């Protein structure tokens, strides 16, 4: 799997420069210039056959060409079969994602479908990572999805939604791996938000509320196009971390953790959440 | 009135005033008494107390004040917000086609979106100029500075792309005497150029070769999502710079850069300082 | 069963603040270590090339100085510890009698009437639980189909836990580094029961529980060496996935460390 | 000295967030245990009268059920661990040769050319340091006036640390429960160097370091039994006071556990 990395290839008069995350080169070869323009045109992954073809076309040796393209930071070779073979985005605001499938190919992310939550007969194949993103939060929406899809072989879920002035991305919820679910997350945040000066959320006020059917909405500030834009980028980069072209490796101790963002301050907070004691996700 | 940092040094009956922009022989006893007094008073003072001090030291009020302002002992700053409006000058102005409308409800007031490629850019007094560039060249900053440095109450802030980073510079205000764009990057290049052992694979080599070849530095392979992220950072910094005085707000709100790693989406807020060698200090 | 304790008795003393703060902390140390994440994650903050400088060294109380009281090695009457086994080889059948030898010697008294274990414990509370995982079809088994067991050090008995197959259990325990590990016959997994670690001494109990884990796997190391088993203590696993596979409830109990056992060709 | 590592090399990799969060947590487990605080503090959240029900028990994976695979005790070839000594008695002189025997056997290879210790370690980083405290005037000493030493397991040597007197050092290590403890000849104190525990594996390193502490004091237990020393691992001490007395800098290093050694009349 040849992954095409971020770069530009710029020319003016007779000077041509390649610039990547890794390096910059004064390109003194027409063939390699052509190769590089062609690659800059393609989104994301390329068949090693296309690459060889493009090299042979410019009369460039294949291993010399490749070694150049790898070490200078233009491409890289990845070997591993990934955990989720496919992603879907399920949303109350699917319009916000109408170019995502197309654009995010260049980031090496395969999103197969954008699904409106309003739709019945929602289908998801095996080993699919389900991204559920809600602007208008309701816990019944999450329950419905877990209920439809928890049993799917190799499934996992991410949930994103707003709380107060924060954008929340939950840890990856994977029945197979035993990781905390949405409700483990939102209880962790509703606990922290109580002006309690206490980590422990439990009291008779909470006990009495647990007698009622679990059900809730979340208070959050109104979104503009700019908050949506910011949200779109974190979704993409989070999906990219998990299933796309890795640019920066994550430590094993944080790879699956929640990501929270203050929309005022733009500061990220990456944080592993514990299982909620009153939650059912471990018993399923 | 803000009292700026300065030093006075004495030996024999001699006294030497040094400020951020000046070095001055003080031979008038009155002015030694005025400077010694201001040296121990920390920051913001009232016009009334300054005038009381001058009268005491037998120094013309008008002339004494002109001296202190001109040598950079004091600046005559607003208790109300420093910039009543703001304008965005960009090589990608279309990214801001709704910004004026939208950012209203964030309390952010942008009067005009302006294409850098426009000939004949005008800009009102007491306006903050946001220069945003996907294609960075230092002469673009030089041009904007030359045109507007002289406008009453003008300030500048610059955003651009360096490899994986989105950099927002500090606010450059002639009136307040805060660092400029070049105080960062020219100093950074100086340090590469004058390294004790030049790293022969320095990023200065790319930057210097782009001058030599008359080429801009492109942002690397921006999509919609990176522009959305950028857009929001811009909105939120402008919000930070709105309703702002030196009475409301500390200088570190201005003398700070924001760098955002576009991959990790992590922000890095760093202090910005003056460079003795920069020509913003005349 | 004769020396049974019900966790209901324990929870009557739990400070829920303490339990929440300890678990919040503990979980920061959990890993997402899987073959499928190899090329997008890492383990070491130190590059491979700079590591040797940090391995098997002494930090000095007076760095740069060399004045010491030397001690004779003539006092040492021990054997050198065997190197920790790597890419294990399961060509040989391994008997239940060998696993049994390890279990009773590392964790139990020779007197089955006695309750005094070969390792000490804060408050004699013994919050750490030993689970047995069978990882090779060439490993003998007590109850066909059962690959996870719980060792009861005082009854000196195995309690069936799980009938997961042998491939799934190897996958959970072996993280992304399974190819280097090779093929061990079996593993022990050492697990903390949080409320049992915390109820008496509060936060300091967490500290005492992790140290206990070490006293335990160390006895196993020494016992393994003596009965001619290779072993490797192992931290390269996905905590929750191991937990899941062994049917542990992560709200109560968590795997601290895995220890692998077998041959080496 | 030959295998010296400078902590300056280590700190180049420190995540300061990680270090702060680990120390914040660690310090929650520190004790203020002093004779003068006996009547206004407590240690156990469980009353003395309910404790026995919790001591030396088994938690079951299927509570209330008794179906198990029993294992023969005929496989056990070990000696029973001695009871942990209490009110130690310092009537007998105790030689440096005996302390030396313990040190080289518990923590060092028999081969002084080898760097392979008798306990394993995450990343071979060995973040845990052993200090020696001399607590009795009836204990022989290598360098008169020096009662704290640092053991260098690879050089097999003692590094002088402190010339605090023997009464002060006993007071710090023995908390408020000194009268029950009696009079040990000496103690080992096991200490974590935080940045050394954290730099490579981050939070999981803390977990690996505390477990290592346990592997270490366990070797000491087994070695003590074999050379006819009594011992008791001990958590009843004021962490910072011990640190202070041993002239450790608490920003870098902290005592995890004390272990007492001596006779019992």
């Amino acid at each position: 799997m040849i992954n095409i990395l971020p770069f530009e290839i710029i020319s003016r008069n007779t000077k041509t420069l390649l610039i990547t995350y890794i390096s910059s080169v004064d390109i003194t070869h027409e063939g390699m210039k052509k190769v590089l323009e062609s690659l800059r045109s393609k989104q994301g992954i390329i068949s090693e056959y296309l690459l060889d073809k493009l090299l042979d076309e410019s009369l460039i040796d294949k291993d010399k060409g490749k070694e150049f393209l790898i070490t200078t930071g233009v491409i890289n070779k990845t070997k591993t079969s990934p955990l989720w073979v496919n992603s879907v985005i399920i949303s109350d605001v699917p319009h916000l994602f109408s170019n995502a499938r197309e654009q995010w190919k260049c980031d090496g992310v395969f999103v197969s479908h954008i699904i409106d939550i309003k739709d019945n007969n929602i289908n998801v194949s095996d080993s699919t990572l389900i991204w559920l993103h809600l602007e208008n939060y309701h816990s019944d929406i999450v329950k419905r999805i877990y209920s439809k899809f928890e049993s799917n072989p190799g499934v996992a879920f991410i949930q994103s939604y707003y709380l107060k002035e924060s954008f929340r991305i939950d840890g990856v919820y994977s029945p197979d791996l035993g990781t905390p679910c949405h409700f483990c997350h939102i209880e962790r945040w509703l606990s922290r938000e109580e002006k309690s000066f206490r980590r422990n959320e439990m009291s008779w006020a909470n006990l009495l509320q647990l007698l009622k059917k679990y059900q809730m909405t979340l208070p959050a500030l109104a979104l503009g196009e700019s908050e949506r834009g910011f949200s779109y980028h974190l979704i993409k980069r989070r999906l990219q971390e998990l299933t796309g072209t890795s640019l920066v490796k994550s430590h094993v101790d944080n790879f699956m953790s929640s990501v929270s963002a203050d929309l005022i301050t733009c500061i990220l907070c990456k944080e592993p959440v514990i299982h909620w004691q009153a939650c059912s996700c471990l018993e399923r | 009135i803000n009292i700026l940092p300065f030093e006075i040094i004495s030996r024999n009956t001699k006294t030497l005033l040094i400020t951020y922009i000046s070095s001055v022989d003080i031979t008038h006893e009155g002015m030694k008494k005025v400077l010694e007094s201001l040296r121990s008073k920390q920051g913001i003072i009232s016009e009334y107390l300054l005038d009381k001090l001058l009268d005491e030291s037998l120094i013309d009020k008008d002339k004494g004040k002109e001296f202190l302002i001109t040598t950079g002992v004091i600046n005559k700053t607003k208790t109300s917000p420093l910039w009543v409006n703001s304008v965005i000058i960009s090589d990608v102005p279309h990214l801001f086609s709704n910004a004026r409308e939208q950012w209203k409800c964030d309390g952010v007031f942008v009067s005009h979106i302006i294409d850098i490629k426009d000939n004949n850019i005008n800009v009102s007094d007491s306006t903050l100029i946001w220069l945003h560039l996907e294609n960075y060249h230092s002469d673009i900053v030089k041009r904007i500075y030359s045109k507007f440095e002289s406008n009453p109450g003008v300030a500048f802030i610059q955003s651009y792309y360096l490899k994986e980073s989105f950099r927002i510079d500090g606010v450059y205000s002639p009136d307040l005497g805060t660092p400029c764009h070049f105080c960062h990057i020219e100093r950074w290049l100086s340090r590469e150029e004058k390294s004790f052992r030049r790293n022969e694979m320095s990023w200065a080599n790319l930057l210097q070769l782009l001058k030599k070849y008359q080429m801009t530095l492109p942002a690397l392979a921006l999509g919609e999502s990176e522009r959305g992220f950028s857009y929001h950072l811009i909105k939120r910094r402008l919000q930070e710079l709105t309703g702002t005085s030196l009475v409301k707000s500390h200088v570190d709100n201005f003398m700070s850069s924001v760098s955002a790693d576009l991959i990790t989406c992590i922000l890095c807020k760093e202090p910005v300082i003056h460079w003795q060698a920069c020509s913003c200090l005349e | 069963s004769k020396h049974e304790l019900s966790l209901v008795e324990v929870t009557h003393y739990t400070d829920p603040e303490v339990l929440a703060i300890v678990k919040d902390f503990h979980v920061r140390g959990n890993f997402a270590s899987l073959p499928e994440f190899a090329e997008r994650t890492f383990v070491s903050a130190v590059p491979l090339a700079h590591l040797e400088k940090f391995e098997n060294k002494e930090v000095l109380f007076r760095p740069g100085f060399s004045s010491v009281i030397n001690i004779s090695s003539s006092h040492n009457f021990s054997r050198e510890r065997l190197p920790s086994g790597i890419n294990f080889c399961d060509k040989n059948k391994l008997s239940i009698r060998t696993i049994e030898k390890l279990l009773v010697n590392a964790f139990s008294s020779p007197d089955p009437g006695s309750v005094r274990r070969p390792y000490p414990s804060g408050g004699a509370l013994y919050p750490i639980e030993v689970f047995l995982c069978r990882l090779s079809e060439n490993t003998e088994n007590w109850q066909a189909g059962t690959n996870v067991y719980h060792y009861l050090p005082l009854s000196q008995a195995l309690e069936p836990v799980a009938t997961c197959n042998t491939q799934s259990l190897y996958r959970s325990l072996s993280g992304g580094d399974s190819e280097r590990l090779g093929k061990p016959h079996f593993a022990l997994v050492y697990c903390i029961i949080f409320e049992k670690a915390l109820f008496k001494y509060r936060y300091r109990g967490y500290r005492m529980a992790l140290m206990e884990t070490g006293s335990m796997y160390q006895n196993a190391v020494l016992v393994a060496d003596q009965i001619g088993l290779k072993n490797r203590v192992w931290a390269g696993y996905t905590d929750s996935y191991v937990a899941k596979t062994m049917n542990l409830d992560q709200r109560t109990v968590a795997p601290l460390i895995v220890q692998f056992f077998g041959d080496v060709n | 000295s030959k295998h010296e590592l400078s902590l300056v090399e280590v700190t180049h990799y420190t995540d300061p967030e990680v270090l702060a969060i680990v120390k914040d947590f660690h310090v929650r487990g520190n004790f203020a245990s002093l004779p003068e605080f006996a009547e206004r503090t407590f240690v156990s959240a469980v009353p003395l009268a309910h404790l026995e029900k919790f001591e030396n028990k088994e938690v079951l994976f299927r509570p209330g059920f008794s179906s198990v695979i029993n294992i023969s005790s005929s496989h056990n070839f070990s000696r029973e661990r001695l009871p942990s000594g209490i009110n130690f008695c310092d009537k007998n002189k105790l030689s440096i040769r005996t302390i030396e025997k313990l040190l080289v056997n518990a923590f060092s290879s028999p081969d002084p050319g080898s760097v392979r210790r008798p306990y394993p370690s995450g990343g071979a980083l060995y973040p845990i340091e052993v200090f020696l405290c001399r607590l009795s005037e009836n204990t022989e000493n290598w360098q008169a006036g020096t009662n704290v030493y640092h053991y260098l397991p690879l050089s097999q040597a003692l590094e002088p640390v402190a010339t605090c007197n023997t009464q002060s050092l006993y007071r710090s290590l023995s908390g408020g429960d000194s009268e029950r403890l009696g009079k040990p000849h000496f103690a080992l104190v096991y200490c974590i160097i935080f940045e050394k525990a954290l730099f490579k594996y981050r939070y999981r390193g803390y977990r690996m370091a505390l477990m290592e502490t346990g592997s270490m004091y366990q070797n000491a237990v087994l070695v003590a039994d074999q050379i006819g020393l009594k011992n008791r691992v001990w958590a009843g001490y004021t962490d910072s006071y011990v640190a202070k007395t041993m002239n450790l800098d608490q920003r870098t290093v902290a005592p995890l556990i004390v272990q007492f050694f001596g006779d019992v009349n």
């Binding site: 420069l17 390649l18 995350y21 890794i22 390096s23 910059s24 080169v25 004064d26 390109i27 003194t28 070869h29 390699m32 460039i60 010399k64 060409g65 150049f68 070490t71 200078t72 930071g73 920066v248 490796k249 | 490899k163 694979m201 320095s202 990023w203 200065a204 080599n205 790319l206 070769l209 | 590059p47 491979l48 090339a49 590591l51 040797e52 391995e55 098997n56 790597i86 580094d177 280097r180 | 990343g123 071979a124």
Partner: peptide, 20 residues
Amino acid sequence: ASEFGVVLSVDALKLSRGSH
């Protein structure tokens, strides 16, 4: 050096990216 160009700059940290 290669037949394709000359390297101007390198981010050494990004180019870099049990016991040893």
